[PDB]
């Protein structure tokens, strides 16, 4: 796996065969444990793993009867730690494709959180303690800002992985829903603690400017997650998305009202938001466009070059493609933010 | 400024939980906008309201009122007072009626989407003295804003009640007319789960729309293809509605005779199995087996057999016993009821290598460079599947096997037919009877032996009839008898030897299996 080049459908066969014809759990998944350890070592930046080999390992773990998920369960915390950090893609580049890896990891993470949410939400609390824990006293500390932005990015990647898994395998009777629908209300708060504190502490670095894109990508991903949950099921998902938007719409409106010059950039994200829904044709998009339109129409007088043109243009299957495009955008933005923050 | 207060009020209705805030929102809405009283309001909103003309403010605030009204009426069970209308609900309804009566297309679309499923909840007797005017809004809704309705129809995620109301209204509207976007919307509706009531509504609307101009070709971009797919879905969904759908299908074929068969062939491969087969069960009604039915069968059966044989290993091996049994019943029904189509598909490897060809073949049958290898391979795969699914020995007829000695097909194809029959008889001899077979099976084996003897007798009496510088060209002919290169073989002993191989397998079946 590490130095040479192999093929799947043999590693999975070897691991499954080792899982069979054995009694003690110590030797049932010796090969599975070795594969998981090798993948972890690759993600810890210690051994030169070919990118194709990394993709093969991730696909092998996703496919799991090889007991791979059981070994992953112990280090899902390490997987989340790897995904949350922004320099991981840049550091792995030392040894474009990386975002795919992230999504794959997200899937298994979501899968584990999928297994850990059964009337107790044990995985949600254990792996993501801050998910139900908004910032203390709702303060705008720059370290709190960075931590909350990282948490929101982790949630966005988890939702992206869950959506990708659902799109690839929608035939499963139990959809991969790591984040509980009610818990989204809490996550709404997190988004505002990025948008409310934006004007004061956004000029310290370029990563703070990219956090706008991160927050809006997470917002649209959560909207699509709620839409997919409602379609697969009903009222709960649409109501939770409605509450999330009713919580984050005054936030974005006041963000626009703070500075009347930077609105342009913010407006971009906002119109980009509807563009995503324009690509997704979501029910909530049609529900909320009659009120989202005046947000930019009243701000058309403050648009610099062509935002008015975009608003006029949008005034009047593909889900997998949109998810892949969003994944690529997130990976590229994270890499660029790591490059800029390295100075 | 205004949007801040509007969203603050609306958040009470937009919550996923039930609280005690909606009453204050309804009272504030009825006291501020409609009645023009800004008491208890902050200076920013007080200035903003007077800043703009009142009707613009009403137009801007209408979506919030519509959303609150829809959410409050849709959760009548959640609030628990379903006997009558809540006081806050009544105030909100009156405010909405005042704003409607006393970018507009987007608001109209929002209202249509919100109140299409939530129209029956509002009754003509539920409107009190205050809601007397609301009749003029609700009474037409128990039956161009229909453009907004149609745009709302093109939604992948819409409730069944709203979709049914929209279909009912459009059917009612097109009833009095006696688009193509209407057809597109109805087709997009039918792409999801369909109930019997909405299926009947769709059948009625499509049979009515045929009177309107829909691809006049008496001579999904095309409306004819969309209508045909819609009719196929309606038939698969399925009393007298069967006859109505059949008449509609006959008319649609009459419109686009050529396009009908092409659409059928495309639909064979578009949808997966258990859908084309269920559609054929609905059409033919072969569960209780003994004009356009024959046309549809002729258009579909060849490609259906091709697609079934392409996935034969994933068809009978898994737990698809119901689907495989339905396929076998369909094949037997086509063999015993449609004939010519089944014979063409079974002998495809002979017909696809040489319309009028089939007629010449059947006339000869009643009389009693390189070859296209791909066509022969496809025909032989089809024939193998057919002999696997049909009764043992029924396929093919003894007359067919007798005439295959002297036919117009390439010699390689005819010998391939003979060898396929030979290997089938051999496998039946080994006990490797078709999987579906493995008291009824005893009768099947006995009839298979009798039919094998029928084959043997026919081939024997045909071979009996057949039996009863020159050196340079003789050597030239002998040295290049490449069978894949036709015109150097047919224009006969090798074909007789393939037939004798079939007879040899028949004999080794009769001497061992039938005797025991």
From Swiss-Prot, chain B:
<protein>
    <recommendedName>
        <fullName>Protein unc-80 homolog</fullName>
    </recommendedName>
</protein>
<comment type="similarity">
    <text>Belongs to the unc-80 family.</text>
</comment>
<comment type="subunit">
    <text>NALCN complex consists of NALCN and auxiliary subunits, UNC79, UNC80 and NACL1. These auxiliary subunits are essential for the NALCN complex function. Interacts (via N-terminus half) with NALCN; this interaction facilitates NALCN surface localization. Interacts (via C-terminus) with UNC79. UNC80 bridges NALCN to UNC79.</text>
</comment>
<comment type="function">
    <text>Auxiliary subunit of the NALCN sodium channel complex. The NALCN sodium channel complex is a voltage-gated ion channel responsible for the resting Na(+) permeability that controls neuronal excitability. This complex is activated by neuropeptides substance P, neurotensin. In addition, the channel is inhibited by extracellular Ca(2+) through the Ca(2+)-sensing receptor. UNC80 is essential for NALCN sensitivity to extracellular calcium.</text>
</comment>
